[PDB]
Every structure is written in C-alpha cells, then in structure tokens.
Amino acid sequence: EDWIFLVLLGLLMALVSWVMDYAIAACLQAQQWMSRGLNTSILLQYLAWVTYPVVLITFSAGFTQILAPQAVGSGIPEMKTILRGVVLKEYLTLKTFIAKVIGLTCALGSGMPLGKEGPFVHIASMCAALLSKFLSLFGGIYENESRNTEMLAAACAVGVGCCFAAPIGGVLFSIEVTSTFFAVRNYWRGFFAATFSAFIFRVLAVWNRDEETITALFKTRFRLDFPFDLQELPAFAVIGIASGFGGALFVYLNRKIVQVMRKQKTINRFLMRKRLLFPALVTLLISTLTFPPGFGQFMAGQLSQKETLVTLFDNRTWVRQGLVEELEPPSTSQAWNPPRANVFLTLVIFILMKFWMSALATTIPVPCGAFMPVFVIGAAFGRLVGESMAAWFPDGIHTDSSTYRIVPGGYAVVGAAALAGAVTHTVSTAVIVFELTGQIAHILPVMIAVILANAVAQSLQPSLYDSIIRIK
Amino acid sequence: EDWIFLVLLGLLMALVSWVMDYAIAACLQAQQWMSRGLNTSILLQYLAWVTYPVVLITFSAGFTQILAPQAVGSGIPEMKTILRGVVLKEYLTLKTFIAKVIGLTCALGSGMPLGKEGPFVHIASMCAALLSKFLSLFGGIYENESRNTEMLAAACAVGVGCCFAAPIGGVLFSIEVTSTFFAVRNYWRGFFAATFSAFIFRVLAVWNRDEETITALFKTRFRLDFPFDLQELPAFAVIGIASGFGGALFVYLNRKIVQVMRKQKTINRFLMRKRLLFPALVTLLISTLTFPPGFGQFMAGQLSQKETLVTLFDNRTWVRQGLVEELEPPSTSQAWNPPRANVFLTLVIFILMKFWMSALATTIPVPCGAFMPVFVIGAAFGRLVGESMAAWFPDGIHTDSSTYRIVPGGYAVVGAAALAGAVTHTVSTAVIVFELTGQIAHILPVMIAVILANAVAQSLQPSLYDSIIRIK
C-alpha cells in the first residue's frame, strides 16, 4: 500500500517537475529571442523587456487570486502548521493546485528572481493528498488521518528533493523546516519516494536529450587531489560569519517590508483597490533596473538564475583572463566583465542590488520561493571573496614545495551554502549544494561556513519561515 | 554552556580517535614486521602469526573481564535502551571507559576482522557523561536528566561521525540506529560536535604527516564526467537485492551462533571454566586459515582491513593487468592475483570464507563492531560483480558513438554500501561511503542498491542490533 503510493507520487512529481522546467525554459528562451530580435532600437527592446515580465506577473497574480487566493505565498509555514496539528483543509484542493502550478510557472518564466522550493513542496503535499483521496475510493484504509499526515510529511521531503534533484538534501531540508520531531519511518518513506522521483526526472531529462547522461545540474570541475589548503580555512570561516549577518539582515528587511505593506493605510487602500498594480509596478522597476544595455552592464542582467549560478561556479580566475583569452570560444563569464567596470566592482554592485531586489520580490502575492535568490546572492558573495583572495595571492598558496592556485568556485559554493543556511537555518544546504555541484572535495570549508552562519543567524534572528508565520 | 560542551567533547574525541588509530597502526606494523622478519622458516612465521593475534585477543578479553565486564559487546543496543528511557548507570563509568578503550586497541591491533563503531560510540557516550559530571561541579544546571539524555544522543552522532570522519553520515547513522524520534535541536548539537570532531582529527592527521592535507580516508579516482551508463542501472540494482539477502542471511547466522553458544550446556560449562580459551581457540583457527603462504594466497591475507578496502576501491581493471604490467611499480592489487588462481576464484573464496569468519568473530566477548567486516565483504562482492561485468564487456558500453570502459571500483562501492545498509537497516550508509570515498559520481546507483537491499532485508530479517537486544 505505502510503497506503491510513494512510487506513484514520485512518478507524477518527476513528470510535473519536468514539464514545469520545460515550460519555464521555453518562456526564458522566448524572452531572450524577443530581446535579441528587437536590437534595432533600444526603445523597442526596453519596451519588450519591460512588458513581458509585467504581463506574466500580472497574469499569474490575477489567475491565483481569482482561482484560489490560498495559493499565494511560499506555503512552507502553512505545512508547518499542518504538521503541527492545525489542519487547513482549504489549502489541499484541485483548484489551488492548478492555480499554484500556473502561477509559479508564469513567475519563473517571467525572469523574476524567485524560487520554486516553496510552491513546489506545497504542490508535493497537495498531490500526495489528492492521490490519498484517489486511493480512498479503492479502499477506506487511507482514511486514517495519522497516515495522511505521514504521507504529507514524506511528500514534503519528496518535493524538496525533486526541486534540487537531491534526495538526501531535500529530505533533510524538509525535516529541518517542516518539523521538530521526525520519525525514521517517515524518513524512510520520504527518502525512498524522493529517490524514485529524482530517478524518473533524470531519466526524462536524458530522454529529452537535455542532459547527455544522468549527471549533476550544476557541474563543477575543481581539483580533487588538492581542492583547498589549511591556510584557506579561516577566511572561509569569515565567509560563513558575514553570510550569517547577510542572513540575519535579510530576514529583517523582508519582515519590515511586509509590515510597511501592512501597517500603511494608504498602501493597504491602494492594494484593495488596485491589487494588480503593485506587482506590475515592482516588475516595471526591476525590469528597468536590470535592463542589459542600461544598468545591466554592471550586473550581467542578460543571464537568468540558472546560467548565473553556473557562471558563479566557474573554476577559472577572471582577474587573470586578460592574457589567455585568445584560444577559447567566448564563454558566459564575459558577461561579468564590462570594459568600464572591474570584476570586483561588478560583484559588489550585483550583491548590493540583487539583495534588495530579492527582498522586495519575496513579498509579491505570487507563489514563489526564496532559497534560489539567496543561493545565487551567496554564490556571488563567495565568488567575490574568492576573486579577492586570488588577487591577494596571484600564484596561489605554497605548501610542501608545491604551489596551489586559488579556485574562486570553491569560495562561491562556500558562500552560497553558508548564506542559504543563514537565511533558512537548515543544515542540509551543504548537502544540497554538494549534490547539485557533484563534488564534495570542499566539504570541510562549506560545512564550517554553514555551521558558523547558522549559529550567528539563530543568535540574531529567527528563520524566514518563522517570520512569515508570525506576520501572516 | 551547550556549545562549549560540544567543542570540548569534539576535541577530546578527536584526540582519543587519533591516539587509537596511531596505536592500532603501530600494532599492525609490528605484526607485519614480525611476520616478515621470520621468513627464514615457515614454521616460525606460522608460530608468530598465530601467537600474536591470540596474545592480543586473550589480553583484551581478560582485561575487559577483570576491569568491567559491562564493556563486553558492541554497546549500540544498550544505548538504544538508554535513549528509550532505561537508564543503565553501570555502563557509563571510568572503569568501563578504560577497559573498552584498551580492549578496542588490542582487538583492532591483533588483525581481527572487527569494527569499532559500536564500542567507539559507547566511548562517546561515556566521555560525554564524564564531562557532564566533571563540569557539574562548576554548575548545577547539568544534573537535569533530560539535557543529559540530549547530550548522550548528540555524543552518539559524535562518535559515529568521528569513526568515519564523516560529519553528515555519522549523525544520520546515529539517528537511524539509536532512536526512532529525534529532535532537530539534538541533530544540531550532535552534528556541530561531530563536525568539530572531524575537523580536529583531520588537523591532527595533517600535523602528524599521516595525510598530506585534509582529505578523504578512502580516496577514489573514478571518472567525474561520465561515471556510469544507464545500461548499468539494472545490474547495480541486482547488486542491492542480493546484498539484501547477504544482509538478511548474515544477521541470521550470527543470531544462530550465539544461540548455539547459549543453548549448548557443555559449551557454556567450558565457558564458565575456561572463558579465556574460546577467544584463544577462535583466534588460532582464524590465524591458521588466514596464513598468507598457506590459504592466504587465495584470500590475500597479507592485507589488513584498511589496505584491503583501499585495494577493492581501485579504478583499474584487474582482469586486464596481464598486458600493461611493465611500466608501473608493484601495486597492492597484485596481492589479489596469485599465479595459480584467477581473480574471480580468489574473490569468491574471499567472500565465502570472510563471511563466516566475520559472523564468528562478531560473537567474541570483546568490544567490537560489525560495520567494518560487512563493508569489506560488500566491497569484495561489488568488486566481483564489476569484474564479471567488465569481462562480459571488455571494451565497455557504447553510448552516443563513444565507448566507456566499466570501472569495477564503482561496483565495489555500490556493493559495500548496499550490504552495509542491508545488515544495519540504515539508509545513511550511502553518505558514509560517499564521504569516505570523496566522490559522489555514482550517487544514484549507490542509493538504488542501498534502498533495495534495505527493503528486502527488512522484509526478511530484523536488524543486527535488534537481534543483539533480543538475544542479550
């Protein structure tokens, strides 16, 4: 009974994940084609690059509001309440399922810096519940509420793992965020179904020829023999500690912005009268600020989240690219190197700007997640630190008559994992980044940074999901 | 309060682990030097190779019996009772600590196919309790029993992780074995202290020049680009399923032997009269059967557990060593290639003999673990399967106009993980083997084999620790 239920849940989750990924990729390539095909005039290019994300955000917000307003938000605090004994039956419905799926698809295809983890884990739970009622017609044994709660808890892990194609990190993330006491039996079911879902997703990706074989999503090519030196340990630790502040600060601003949205009476009146205007206005602002030929030259705004994260994990040193740039094709990293701004300045601008863009975008009444923007911004911070350290040591570190060149990609991974843990207060972030990159050679630096960031963040601020549950 | 307690626990655990490893290595190298220095006559070499392990086993058994008979056994089921609410105060004493440490040192230096995880996690519990009692003189807040239990649970993860120098795998393994409901707060403390345990252990290893840098214990060098092909998926799955039987069978035979050891009145009377004779007799038998110039030529008896496990993880194809063996130094793998027996025959003999050897050695009244023998035998099984598959496909598998050679090392890793999971009924074993090897390229086949083996084993037989708690 249970095992076949997990198998079916994993199969349908893999299918849904694949179709959503295909849809968002199609929307992204359509946006890129529209932007590139209107390069004859800057005005028309700006008009298209503005109207497209605005249209998708307004459509998603309107569809979610009309069909099911409960689909608004991440939904992770909602399932925290569900697993804490508060049964909100309204959230687990077919209408909310369709509304949330379409809204998240449009939001991710609009190019907005948003994540999928929250809406996708919500869809995981909703699909598990719908399959529970579907199997209830063939037998009343599924009518037990305790078994339904167990399947919901397992499906949370399944969805979080299928988000990253990381069955271990996803289940650990679900255990950390959705519960405080977890049974190993529920761990077994959750990890089993997440494994099957990841397997089917990878098989579908290979079948579509998106990936040559079953491999990692964010492949890194760091040195395995000597990935890091001992003298690199303390700076890595700093990367954690500052990231913790970057976490504790972030959960602050978001909690403030919503309060500014809620406490202000004029803003509330405008929202109640013109609820579709606010997402349109903020999307206009962010699209104007990330216009590639405008300010986007200082932020590499022509890249979406996936390719930006891939570039931030590059193993080459950008600062020294100016001498051996004659025998290779033009790589994506060139987008981070405008002729007028240095690499460090571009990284600093990207950090300082994407920080508040993500902070404001997390407040939008659309189904979206926050783990992806935090991961990207932490990867940028780690890349900045790694490039600075490589500049300080141009020829690397000397150890035992050997010279090891500093790889900024390891620092970027360290920073991304540390800041994700600091924002979320979850330990699996290291496991998730390890399974995404496919290399665990940097296990100790990533782990130390994650622990330090999580500790300092917990000392300063509660988690983002706790902030949401306390504000909502 | 808590955090500094974890830091000190990790520091002392790393020191104890390092000194234990140094002592075991010294005993092993002394045994090897004694065996090699008496090559002038086979009789004297046999006499030394017999007496030395017998002497260490008898000394360990006698010291454990005289100082603290409670140190006998693995210690994992007893702490399962401890965390289940049965407080056995007699186990957590200084005398039991000393007896168990010295017995572990002697037993693992005797060359016996035994493991340390159980007795070592028992050391973890005892040292955490002793540190609590020591610092309780400085403050009363620690005579609370609930927090004592929390730190005991954390020390469980600490010890399990420090055994493998794997911060994530150790904690997850501890959660699987020692508890059914675990708090994320306890997970945080245990994982924190285990992480710093591994950090200090690796720092000490680098300082002693044992390892060049902070790296994995069982380094693999598999191809990272394309580690495996899809056509390898079903056979890998078979590797799991059979391993599950190999698990369910193993927990059977052990539970039988002790039962035969318990029900038989004559053997029991001999044990009360001659309790030191039985370990001596079994050590004599196993030393005779693993005599290198005798039967050891068919079992590679010159190699202890560590180098045997390293060799089983070799990326080279042994069947094809016979043509390119002129331009390399003599590798350890040559110990598996006698002139009279093929690789497959030697692997089958090693499997069939070491299986019952570990089954009998697990019953000895000395502090020992079973994860190491199971891991080694599963690695041998996986290596056999990989070599057979490579023989079936001499030039590898063809995919997309490319030809990829099959690496038996990945199969060995898969088999070891699957059989360890089948014996222990723990999913985490994949994480432990991943952190030991340092490569997660074969991640999906490893988890598929582990889940299949765990499922079939759980359907067939309960876990080894449950067998111990039901027999003891």
Matching residue, tokens 């690789």 = B343
Helices B167-178, B429-437: axis angle to 10 degrees equals 160
Q: Over A152-164, what HEC string results?
A: HHHHHHHHHHHHH
Q: In this structure, which CATH number among 1.10.1060.10, 1.10.3080.10, 1.10.275.10, 3.30.565.10 belongs to the domain A2-207?
A: 1.10.3080.10
d(CA A194, CA A205): 16
Q: Cα(first)–Cα(last) distance of chain B, in Å? A: 37
- Specify the DSSP class assigned to residue A6: H
In one letter, which amino acid is B12?
Answer: L
CB of A49 within 8 A of CB of A37? no
Contact at CB, B180 and A185, closer than 8 angstroms: yes
In angstroms, what CA-CA distances link B412 with A132, A256, B378, B407? 39, 54, 7, 9
Question: In the 8-state DSSP scheme, what is residue A335?
Answer: G
**DSSP H or E segment with residue A181:** strand A181-183
Quick one: tokens of B193?
Answer: 């202290």
By Cβ distance, the residue of B168, B191, B438 closest to A441 is: B438
- Other beta carbons within 10 angstroms of residue B94's beta carbon come to 13
Residue pair B10/B91 in contact (Cβ under 8 Å)? The answer is: no
The H or E element containing residue A200 is helix A184-207
Contact present, B415 and B422 (Cβ < 8 Å): no
Query: Do residues B35 and B51 lie in contact, with contact meaning Cβ atoms separated by under 8 Å?
Result: no
> In Å, how far is A184's CA from the nearest CA of chain B?
5
Contacts of B176 in chain A (CB under 8 A): 184
Q: Which amino acid is at A62?
A: G
Q: For residue A327, give how far its alpha carbon lies from the nearest alpha carbon of chain B (Å).
A: 23
Give the CA distances from residue A149 to residues A84, A183, A200, in Å, rounded to whole numbers and listed in that order: 10, 12, 25
Domains B2-207 and B230-471 share a fold: yes
Which residues are CB-contacts of B407 (< 8 A; sequence separation ≥ 6)?
B222, B223, B227, B315, B317, B386
Q: Tokens standing for A173? A: 């993330």
- Structure-token pair, residue B210: 């044992």
Close Cβ partners of A426 (under 8 Å, ≥ 6 residues apart): A172, A173, A176, A177, A420, A454
Q: Are B447 and A167 in contact (CB < 8 Å)? A: yes
Q: How far apart are CA B124 and CA B158, in angstroms?
A: 7
- 3 state SS for chain B: CHHHHHHHHHHHHHHHHHHHHHHHHHHHHHHHHHHHHCCCCHHHHHHHHHHHHHHHHHHHHHHHHHHCHHHCCCCHHHHHHHHCCCCCHHHCCHHHHHHHHHHHHHHHHCCCCCECHHHHHHHHHHHHHHHHHHHHCCCHHHHCHHHHHHHHHHHHHHHHHHHHCCHHHHHHHHHHHHCCEEEHHHHHHHHHHHHHHHHHHHHHHHHCCCCCCCCCCCCCCCCCCCCCCHHHHHHHHHHHHHHHHHHHHHHHHHHHHHHHHHHCHHHHHHHHHHCCHHHHHHHHHHHHHCCCCCHHHHCCCCCCHHHHHHHHCCCCCHHHCCCCCCCCCCCHHHHHCCCCCCHHHHHHHHHHHHHHHHHHHCCCCCCCECHHHHHHHHHHHHHHHHHHHHHHCCCCEEECCEEECCCHHHHHHHHHHHHHHHHHCCCCHHHHHHHHHCECCCHHHHHHHHHHHHHHHHHHCCCHHHHHHHHC
Which are the contacts of B102, defined by CB distance < 8 A and separation ≥ 6?
A: B60, B63, B64
- Strand-strand pairing, A397-399 and B397-399: unpaired
User: Which amino acid, one-letter code, is at A12?
Assistant: L
Boundaries of every domain in chain B:
2-207, 230-471
Burial of B211 (0-12, 13-18, 19+ CB in 10 A): middle
- Contact residues for A12 (Cβ-Cβ < 8 A; gap 6+): A127, A131
| Token pair for B320 | 């094809």
Of the candidates B181, B221, B400, the beta carbon closest to that of A183 is on B181
Q: Does B34 touch chain A (CB under 8 A)?
A: no
**HSE of B144 in the Cβ direction (CA atoms, 13 Å)?**
7
Give me the residue label for tokens 């990190």.
A169
DSSP A138: T
- A157 to chain B: which residues are within 8 Å by CB? none
CA dihedral over B174, B179, B181, B182, signed as positive or negative: negative
CA B120 to CA B12: how far, in whole Å? 13
Compute CA distances A12 → A148, A162, A201, whole Å.
18, 11, 10
Q: Which 3 state secondary structure label does DSSP give A115?
A: strand
CB contacts, 8 Å: A429 with chain B: none
Residues 416-435 of A with CB under 8 A from B: 427, 430-431, 434-435
User: Which chain A residue has its CA at the smallest distance from B222's CA?
Assistant: A224
**C-alpha of B223 from chain center:** 26
Query: Which residues are CB-contacts of A276 (< 8 A; sequence separation ≥ 6)?
Result: A58, A61, A62
Q: What angle (nearest 5°) sits at the alpha carbon of residue A189, between those of residues A183 and A192?
A: 135
Give the resolution value in Å.
Answer: 3.5
Please name the residues in contact with A401: beta carbons below 8 A apart, sequence gap of 6 or more: none
Task: List the single residue in B with minimal CA-CA distance to A446.
Answer: B195
Half-sphere exposure of B320 (CA within 13 A, CB side): 17
User: Residue B262: what residue type?
Assistant: R
**Cβ of A232 under 8 Å from any chain B Cβ?**
no
Instruction: Calculate the dihedral angle through the C-alpha atoms of B175, B181, B183, B188, rounding to the nearest 10 degrees.
Output: 0
Size of interface A-B (CB pairs under 8 A): 101
Separate counts of helices (H) and strands (E) for chain A = 18, 3
Whether the CB of A147 is below 8 Å from some CB of chain B: the reply is: no
Smallest Cβ–Cβ distance between A188 and the set B202, B427, B444 belongs to B427
Query: For residues B317 and B233, what is the distance between their CA atoms, to the nearest angstrom?
Result: 20
DSSP state of A439: B
Supply A254's token pair: 């978001």
Q: How far apart are CA B272 and CA B276, in angstroms?
A: 9
The CATH class given to the B230-471 domain equals: mainly alpha
Q: Residue A25 contacts by C-beta under 8 Å, 6 or more apart in sequence?
A: none
What is the number of residues in chain A?
Answer: 472
Phi/psi of residue A24, nearest 5 degrees: -70, -35
Please list every residue in chain B whose beta carbon sits closer than 8 Å to the beta carbon of residue A222.
none
For residues B120 and A290, give the distance between their C-alpha atoms in angstroms, rounded to a whole number.
56
Note whether B213 and A404 are within 8 A (CB). no
Tell me the CA distances in angstroms from A52 to A59, A106, A107, A222, one per residue in order: 11, 11, 11, 38
Q: How far is Cα A199 from Cα A10, in angstroms, rounded to an integer?
A: 9
Q: Which of B240, B250, B212 is nearest to B424 (CA)?
A: B250
Q: For residue A459, give the nearest of A264, A247, A219, A189 by alpha carbon.
A: A247
Residues A84, A86, A88, A91: what is their CA dihedral angle, to the nearest 10 degrees?
-10
- Report the SS3 class of residue A316: coil
Given CB atoms, is B221 within the 8 Å cutoff of chain A? Answer: yes
CA A375 to chain centre: 6
Of B379, B43, B53, B18, the C-alpha closest to B218 is B379
- Of the CA atoms within 13 Å of residue B305, those in its CB half-sphere come to 26
Proportion of chain A in helix, strand, coil states, percent, rounded to 5: 70, 5, 25
Q: Shortest Cα distance from B441 to chain A (angstroms)?
A: 7
- Chain A stretch 391-410, residues whose beta carbon is closer than 8 A to a beta carbon of chain B: 399-400
Ligand-binding site membership of A371 (annotated): yes
Q: What is the DSSP string of A364-416?
A: SSSS-BSHHHHHHHHHHHHHHHHHHHHHHSTT-EEETTEEE---HHHHHHHHH
Please give the Cα distance from A13 to A120 (Å, whole number): 9
CA-closest candidate to residue A190, choices A162, A222, A210: A162
* Cα dihedral A83→A85→A86→A90 (10° resolution): 60
> Which is it for the CA torsion A422, A423, A425, A429, positive or negative?
negative
Q: Whose CA is closest to A425, among B274, B281, B185?
A: B185
**What are the Cα distances from residue A417, in Å, to A11, A20, A169, B407?**
29, 25, 12, 32
Residue A270 CB: number of other CB atoms within 10 A? 14
| Residue listed under structure tokens 């994540």 | A115
Nearest to B420 by CA among B434, B409, B408, B407: B434
